[PDB]
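User: Modeling request: complex.
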Amino acid sequence: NEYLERVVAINRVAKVVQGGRRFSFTALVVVGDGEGSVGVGYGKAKEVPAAIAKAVEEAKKHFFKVPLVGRTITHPVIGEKAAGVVMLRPASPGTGVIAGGSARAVLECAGVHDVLAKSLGSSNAINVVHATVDALQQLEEPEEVARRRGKSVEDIAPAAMLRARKEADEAAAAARMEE
RNA sequence: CAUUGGAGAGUUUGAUCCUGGCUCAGGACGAACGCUGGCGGCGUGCUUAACACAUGCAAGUCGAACGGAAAGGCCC
Ligand SMILES: [Mg+2]
Ligand SMILES: [Mg+2]
Ligand SMILES: [Mg+2]
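Assistant: Request completed. Predicted assembly structure:
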């Protein structure tokens, strides 16, 4: 539909009571637009559909923009929440999302189409997802880098990156008109 | 004054997170084995006993260095 989502992982958690165990289901969802806004939602329920829906509606209110320099990451980053380290590097067009399941789902929902992502540290899906999330949040878009440094993009950033951004904008124009 | 390049999964708990080993998906081979087997092209083929070897062959050539004449060859 309008917003593209992947179910990263589901788990069957339980609570022990005098009678026995009270099982429950946890859901990781990643919901994105495919063009730069993406979020992750955690859902608790007694049932898989309810947990998934709760996670999705909780993720809707956690959409953060991701800077894409033409279908790829702006610059290499390394994120880490708790113990989930995720390394991201931009890749040439056509490389694809070379990433592990959870991080790959996060990137595909964010709309990145050429990226190299490695999962260092723990392999727990939730923590790896948070590490991919803050790795993406660490991304620093070239115009705001120029604002930070009090300079211009032509003075701070690589000419190849800027050029590739122009050609990507031109294919954007193409699609738009074509429509 | 950009890059040609990096994927995980299972398993400790009632459940969780971490640590952590174990196991697996890939590629490879001077390989062997099992089942099966049409052809062609190009390679490769004792990794162990530097263990012991029947048989044939694998280093000869020169008469324009020499005496020669055992064969073939010409002349009697
Ligand atoms: Mg650490
Ligand atoms: Mg224990
Ligand atoms: Mg168990």
